[PDB]
């Protein structure tokens, strides 16, 4: 009905973004573990596997966040990387979910 149509139209999925770490040949594995623990609340075990994924797969997803939070994570991780003089690049892509 009219009320039910109003419900339907208000169920557009949230714009969500994957926060991604991209591999490079200069950033220490230990530093990537540190990043994952500091900014994403991963335990050492989970942080280690994701870091391995970065190294062997080329990139890995750190988690999925609202646009606003995702941009905040990217800013922080990149800042942390540069101040430690590493090229590690944290970026975003739309999840579609």
């Amino acid at each position: 009905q009219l009320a039910e149509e109003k419900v339907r139209d208000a169920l557009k999925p949230p714009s969500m973004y994957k926060v991604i770490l991209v591999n490079d040949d200069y950033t220490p594995m230990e530093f990537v573990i540190d990043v994952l623990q500091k900014f994403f609340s991963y335990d050492v075990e989970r942080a280690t596997q994701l870091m391995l994924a970065v190294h062997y797969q080329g990139k890995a997803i750190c988690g999925v966040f609202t646009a606003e939070v995702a941009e905040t994570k990217v800013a922080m991780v990149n800042k942390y990387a540069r101040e430690n003089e590493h090229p590690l690049l944290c970026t975003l892509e739309k999840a579609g979910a």
Binding site: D25, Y26, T27, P28, M29, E30, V32, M51
Partner: peptide, 11 residues
């Protein structure tokens, strides 16, 4: 990424 050096001292 860069792997850390292994630790060894007379084993």
């Amino acid at each position: 990424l860069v792997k850390s050096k292994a630790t060894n001292l007379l084993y």
